[PDB]
Design a protein around this ligand. Structure first.
Ligand SMILES: Nc1ncnc2c1ncn2[C@@H]1O[C@H](COP(=O)(O)OP(=O)(O)OP(O)(O)=S)[C@@H](O)[C@H]1O
Ligand SMILES: Nc1ncnc2c1ncn2[C@@H]1O[C@H](COP(=O)(O)OP(=O)(O)OP(O)(O)=S)[C@@H](O)[C@H]1O
Lengths: 684, 55
């Protein structure tokens, strides 16, 4: 009997309780039963994305076979999962693997269709050793073999509909991703399962927050899997936070330190201090052991409750009479009421410790999965975020308007008020040249991560051709650069919560703008390989300078909103209308005035002070020299860079000249006082 | 569609409602061992047997 040798009896594990309570899914199990009883096409295959519970739905079909919710023709069947492993684990000779496999097939023909075979990973099944699945082919659509498929979405498109020789057998069962509330209904039968293994309690606000935040933020994986991942991993978090403590570490390090100090002193007083801290340590240790014993009793009695539920379902299959009312009305409510007495007892005694899983734990576990601050407001990041305008004005001095709009955008994404169909803010920074566009984007990158060069800064002026879409997005399959993929659709799929700078966007060839339409419409972007990257946690900022003539001409003596409309019409001459219809806010700058340039001069002098302090030369300045910089580094046509490189020239050339001369020794303070026209560096 | 009608013929709903009701009242009557539930259970068992024989 090879059936006892190389098969997994899922009816055995179903009756033994080694499977899991499948919730909902009546429609898809029913349609599977439909396809199992046809004349031709007697082989349902399941088509779902990887991780939507296909094996779970097959085992739920198995439990409905055991529980007798099926029609009479399926009452008494056998569900056998074919062991791939033990067949290969002894194979040495010519086809002895397939000898075992053919013996199993002859035993299935011997069982005469009373055994419903189930072999998942069907795309792997077709070649696994005439090889592994086309031995089977005549027996499928004749009432002999009824193998039930269950396989992935794309691999169905690989190895099944292309291989059309077996295609008149199998049938599509699109196992859809269940919704949010359906997954909530799933976990409320699996909350009870995970509390037997992690010895902690799970709270229903944490379950509903886990379902909603998992469905919104982790976009790689899918329901119902990712919510289970968040619940399990937060259970591990709380199990570790219980399993430490902290005050025991503090007291232990302190008592061994004072132990070494008193053993050195052998005035003392440290015998008394040591005895006090040892008594405190013994008290906290005894409280810790008492809390551990409390949780141990609570978890053992909860496992007793769960085994009572398992045994009463065993009795429901069996049908004893006094055992039913006995187990139910004796065991269940008394164990529930003393379990809740233990619950309020742990509400009394757990001080040292979080016995339960809150939704802030799901927030922390999710915030370590991606990086999005779903974390609640602590003191540091909240006070850092409320002073957004002061931070960005202490790098980007000038330009109130874009700082206001960007600050409001990031606040509206932290508070949750942003639409989860679009990205956080799609911006189109117009304006003249050299006015802090790229430095506003570096200011956001240095606020959000504390780093200037932590932003996907894709220059767009490398994208002046039609193969540029192949550069940024990816390379279509079977070509040279298939292995790497794009530079945008890969550098976001690793790191969701990031900033994507597209600098000088109008220089690019407009099929790239077709790609950007796909981004700002969906948020998911299609590459050459095929899978998509959710851009609804990013901040797409596009710079340009398209209205430079018009803004430098007419931003004086004109208002703000009509200027925005006028240059937006200029943009409509440049871009597509459907494109800039899909923008959050098109903030339009203004050229920099005198006070702004004095402040920019002070910023650049501060970074120069930092450079020459790492060099080891302390520098003071007279404000007249600052006026010389203001009167040489000012003109409206170029913006801010004449100031920067006028600073560079008139300060750094005589200064670095003399520093290489050896004239200026470190230690003294270089007073940059004025010459008649130049700026002298003096030593006194 | 043939499979759907094969299921609806081979597998009913009111029998499930009646079977859950009689096993629940059997639980309650086994617990109470006032009654009235011997009579109610006998009525529902007679109705269940009638529907079963008709089926
Ligand atoms: N209806 C359900 N009721 C209870 N648990 C479920 C349900 N659907 C899915 N699950 C859980 O989700 C898990 C998914 O298991 P699998 O079916 O193996 O996943 P999958 O979708 O089959 O992906 P693969 O190909 O098997 S790795 C199950 O093991 C259960 O823990
Ligand atoms: N308000 C400001 N605060 C600090 N630096 C500024 C400010 N405005 C302009 N700058 C300087 O302007 C220089 C030019 O940087 P960019 O941002 O590239 O210029 P932009 O004016 O924003 O437009 P483009 O197209 O990028 S040249 C930077 O080196 C900054 O030092």
């Amino acid at each position: 009997q090879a059936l006892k040798k190389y098969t997994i009896d899922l009816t055995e594990r179903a009756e033994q309780g080694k499977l899991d309570p499948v919730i909902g899914r009546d429609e898809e199990i029913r349609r599977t039963i439909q396809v199992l009883q046809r004349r031709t096409k007697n082989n349902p295959v399941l088509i779902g994305e990887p991780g939507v519970g296909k094996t779970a739905i097959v085992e739920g079909l198995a439990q409905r076979i055991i529980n007798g919710e099926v029609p009479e023709g399926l009452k008494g069947r056998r569900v056998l999962a074919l062991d791939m492993g033990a067949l290969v684990a002894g194979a040495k000779y010519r086809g002895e693997f397939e000898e075992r496999l053919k013996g199993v097939l002859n035993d299935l023909a011997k069982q005469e269709g009373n055994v419903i075979l189930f072999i998942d990973a069907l795309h792997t099944m077709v070649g696994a050793g005439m090889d592994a699945g086309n031995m089977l082919k005549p027996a499928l659509a004749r009432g002999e073999l009824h193998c039930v498929g269950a396989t992935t979405l794309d691999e169905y498109r690989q190895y099944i509909e292309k291989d059309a020789a077996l295609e008149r057998r199998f049938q599509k069962v699109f196992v859809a991703e269940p919704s949010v509330e359906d997954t909530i209904a799933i976990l409320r039968g699996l909350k009870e399962r995970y509390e037997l293994h992690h010895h902690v309690q799970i709270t229903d606000p944490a379950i509903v927050a886990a379902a909603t935040l998992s469905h919104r933020y982790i976009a790689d994986r899918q329901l119902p899997d990712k919510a289970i991942d968040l619940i399990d991993e937060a259970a591990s978090s709380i199990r570790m936070q219980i399993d430490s403590p902290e005050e025991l570490d503090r007291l232990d390090r302190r008592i061994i330190q004072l132990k070494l100090e008193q053993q050195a002193l052998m005035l003392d007083m440290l015998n008394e201090e040591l005895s006090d801290k040892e008594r405190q340590y013994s008290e906290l240790e005894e409280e810790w052991k008492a809390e551990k014993a409390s949780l141990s009793g609570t978890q053992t009695i909860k496992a007793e409750l769960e085994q009572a539920k398992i045994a009463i379902e065993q009795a429901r299959r069996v049908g004893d009479l006094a055992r039913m009312s006995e187990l139910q009305y004796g065991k269940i409510p008394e164990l529930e009421k003393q379990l809740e007495a233990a619950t309020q007892l742990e509400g009394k005694t757990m001080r040292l410790l979080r016995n339960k899983v809150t939704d802030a734990e799901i927030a922390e576990v999710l915030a370590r999965w991606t990086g999005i601050p779903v974390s609640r407001m602590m003191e540091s990041e909240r006070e850092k975020l409320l002073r957004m305008e002061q931070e960005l004005h202490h790098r980007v001095i000038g330009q109130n308007e874009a700082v206001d709009a960007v600050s409001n955008a990031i606040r509206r994404s932290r508070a949750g008020l942003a639409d989860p169909n679009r990205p956080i803010g799609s911006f189109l920074f117009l304006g003249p040249t050299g006015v802090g566009k790229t430095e506003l984007c570096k200011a956001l990158a240095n606020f959000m991560f504390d780093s200037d060069e932590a932003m996907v800064r894709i220059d767009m002026s490398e994208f002046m051709e039609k193969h540029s879409v192949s550069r940024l997005v990816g390379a279509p399959p079977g070509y040279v650069g298939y292995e790497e993929g794009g530079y945008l659709t890969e550098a976001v799929r690793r790191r969701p919560y990031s900033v994507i700078l597209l600098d000088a966007v109008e220089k690019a060839h407009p099929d790239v703008f077709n790609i950007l339409l796909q981004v700002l419409d969906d948020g998911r972007l299609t590459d050459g390989q095929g899978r998509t990257v959710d851009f609804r946690n990013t901040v797409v900022i596009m710079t340009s300078n398209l209205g430079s003539d018009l803004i430098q001409e007419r931003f004086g003596e004109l208002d703000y909103a009509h200027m925005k409309e006028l240059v937006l019409g200029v943009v409509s001459h440049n871009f597509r209308p459907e494109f800039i219809n899909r923008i959050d806010e098109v903030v339009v700058f203004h050229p920099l005035g005198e006070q702004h340039i004095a402040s920019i001069a002070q910023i650049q002098l501060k970074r120069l002070y930092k450079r020459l302090e790492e060099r080891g030369y302390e520098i003071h300045i007279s404000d007249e020299a600052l006026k010389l910089l203001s009167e040489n580094g000012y003109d409206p046509v170029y913006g801010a860079r004449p100031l920067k490189r006028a600073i560079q020239q008139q300060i750094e050339n005589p200064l670095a000249q003399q520093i290489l001369s050896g004239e200026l020794v470190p230690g003294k303070v270089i007073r940059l006082e004025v010459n008649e026209d130049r700026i002298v560096a003096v030593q006194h």
